[PDB]
Amino acid sequence: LSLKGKKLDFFGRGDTYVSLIDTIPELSRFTACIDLVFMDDNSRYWMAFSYITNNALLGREDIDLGLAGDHQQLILYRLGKTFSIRHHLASFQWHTICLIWDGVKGKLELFLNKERILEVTDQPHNLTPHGTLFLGHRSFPGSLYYFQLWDHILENEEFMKCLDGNIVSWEEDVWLVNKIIPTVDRTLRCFVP
Amino acid sequence: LSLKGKKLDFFGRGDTYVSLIDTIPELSRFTACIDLVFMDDNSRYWMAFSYITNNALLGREDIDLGLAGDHQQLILYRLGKTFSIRHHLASFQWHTICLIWDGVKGKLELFLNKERILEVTDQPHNLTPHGTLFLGHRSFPGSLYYFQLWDHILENEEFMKCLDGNIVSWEEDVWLVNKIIPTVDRTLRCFVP
Ligand SMILES: [Mg+2]
Ligand SMILES: [Mg+2]
């Protein structure tokens, strides 16, 4: 299924997920962005996207890459390590969160719209290949939109220019939906007839 | 020299530093806190405290532990890795910043007063022993006060209770001053006649 012009209303929907049909190749550098909106003020732990490999099916404890959080925190997973920062994100407003991984330098950065909020150093490492990307997956407390993944480092000034990822693009017919109906919203940030 | 009842006015003083006379032992877990106040609104890169070992005298690029920042960021150094977070700290107000290192779990946390702002995961590792602790060292753009280091993990609720570190304590006669005159200020948070 293509998600062009559509968002994913995950709020309250515990047995729902969306997954990318294509496995993802080995990436030394990449940028991954998603748009999200929280539809409740005080939430529990949540996941927006996760990249799951065989590492995870052992005890369900190790995620190669993911964006998660709680009511006061954003949480990044990298190769089983976690990095958590305090956030004050408003509910009922769309936010764009982008992650940059420079596997050559071993640098992981998190942005809110054009502004960097976290830079972490870890082992230089590529992205482990052939995992599966999951969205929303208890369920994300709101809506998700416009996931993109590029095999290179985007500059801040490009994050909001409504580009399509060259590895994963929302608009492509690459998505598997489980018990969720994507919905059209012509007010969405990058919507174009 | 003892720093009891005194602060260190480093603002604008480029060739000044304070160092701890005692070398620090190997620590598997520790808490380190300092009070700081910025005396200019828009600042450049600064360091509040650093723990320097022989790793650093090679090209002056690797710091085993340090707290640094710029006008919009707080920066933690651990064994040469950096972790940077966006901050919005007000000038002309005292802030208490505490770091917790759990070398058993490989967990490094940063707090502003009682509130956690960063949790990072890294290699489980102890603190490298016998380095030298430096304060202020171009110079820190304001004043520093009440550095403490304990060989155990303090809970949030204790950070502001004006305890003395059991490894390093501000009030002990353990400090070497270079070209700075510590100043008494009876309004300081933990001052007691
Ligand atoms: Mg396009
Ligand atoms: Mg005392």
Numbering used by the authors:
A (entry chain A), B (entry chain A): 26 to 162, 176 to 231
Passage from the reporting paper:
Here, we showcase the example of ADGRG4, an orphan aGPCR that possesses a PTX-like domain at its very N-terminal tip, followed by an extremely long stalk containing serine-threonine repeats. Using X-ray crystallography and biophysical methods, we determined the structure of this unusual PTX-like domain and provide experimental evidence for a homodimer equilibrium of this domain which is Ca2+-independent and driven by intermolecular contacts that differ vastly from the known soluble PTXs. However, only three domains are predicted by homology within this huge ECR—the PTX-like domain, the hormone receptor binding motif (HRM), and the GPCR autoproteolysis-inducing (GAIN) domain. Our data alongside of theoretical considerations lead to the hypothesis that ADGRG4 acts as an in vivo sensor for shear forces in enterochromaffin and Paneth cells of the small intestine.
The crystallographic data revealed a β-sandwich fold. Six and seven antiparallel β-strands assemble the two β-sheets A and B, respectively. The A face is covered by another loop of residues 189 to 205 with a short helical stretch. This loop coordinates a metal ion via the side chain carboxy group of the residue D202. Two disulfide bridges stabilize the protein fold. C58-C123 links strands β3 and β8 in the β-sheet of the A face. C200-C228 connects the long A face loop 189-205 with the C-terminal residues of the PTX-like domain. The unit cell of the G4-PTX crystals on the other hand contained only a single protein chain in the asymmetric unit. However, there is only one interface generated by point symmetry that exhibits a sufficient surface area for homodimerization. Two protomers interact such that the two strands at the edge of the sandwiched β-sheet interact with those of the other molecule (β7 with β10′ and β10 with β7′).
